[PDB]
Amino acid sequence: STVPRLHRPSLQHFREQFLVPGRPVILKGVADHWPCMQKWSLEYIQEIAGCRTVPVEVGEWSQTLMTVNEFISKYIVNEPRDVGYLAQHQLFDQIPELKQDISIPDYCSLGDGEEEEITINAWFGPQGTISPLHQDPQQNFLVQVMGRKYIRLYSPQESGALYPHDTHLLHNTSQVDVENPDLEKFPKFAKAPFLSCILSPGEILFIPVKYWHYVRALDLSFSVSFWWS
Ligand SMILES: O=C(O)c1cc(C(=O)O)c(NCc2ccccc2)cn1
């Protein structure tokens, strides 16, 4: 079944019906008028960030460094040879002029943490970037600015059917390939219930703390995640 969509729910409505019980929801009408929604093009990103060094994941992922200009030329526009992903980078601490184009969702103030401790990551890459099914240790607002993303969500109650890796460093990551699972090795995965959605520009997906999520970009995509408690 699909993640529910609510237009600008009250802080109390969000707190009681989603944050406290830990239920995913897509928030409409919240981020859809942030300046990033109309301003962020490849052209704007190149103008404001082109010459800055960014970390890039190259898909068995390896990690390298290059300028934003280099990243767009090699992994976005010029019939890329491999998949490059400007992933989980605090681009707005590096480039404060870009932080003017976003805000922190008001719903974050329902958390128990300081606003200064909210981690804001950029997720900028071509069509076809894929995450492993994984869980994070904080709440998350994932804001879609450019393009769409297909996302699959499994509650923490279903962890047993997701076969987490046995190593400590990877215990938060599933061994299963969500979209082509090995049911001979991971048979419990097939009957695990889940929510899914296509997240589109202007929309905010609330991923509850420790909720397992899987993310595949359907187009050239730019997302901003807010990790908060
Ligand atoms: O908001 C999040 O918590 C979040 C969003 C994404 C995302 O892709 O948008 C994500 N993917 C991780 C990844 C994917 C491909 C290569 C290397 C890392 C992880 N976490």
Ligand SMILES: [Mn+2]
């Ligand atoms: Mn994540």
